[PDB]
Amino acid sequence: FVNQHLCGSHLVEALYLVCGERGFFYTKPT
Amino acid sequence: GIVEQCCTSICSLYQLENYCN
């Protein structure tokens, strides 16, 4: 695992993969 | 801000774990 360019799915998917079942909130600009 | 940090730049899962609940 290392630095990876993410934005939407690959960000929630990245967080969903880093947080695992814990999940995350994922913020965004409006 | 992993959005502009990972979308405008890059981030590490370690930084992604900081977004966990």
Of residues A18, A14, A17, the one with CA closest to residue B10:
A14
Question: Is A27 an 8 Å CB contact of chain B?
Answer: yes
Calpha distance B21→B13 (Å, rounded)? 14
Number of A–B residue contacts, CB under 8 Å: 67
Asked if residue B8 lies in contact with residue A12, where contact means CB atoms within 8 angstroms, the answer is no
Calpha distance A30→A14 (Å, rounded)? 20
Determination approach: NMR
Q: Which residues contact B20 (CB under 8 A, 6 or more apart)?
A: A15, A18, A19, A22, A23, A24
Whether residue B10 and residue A14 make contact (CB cut-off 8 A), yes or no, is no
- Tokens 């994922």 belong to residue: A26
Calpha distance B2→A29 (Å, rounded)? 11
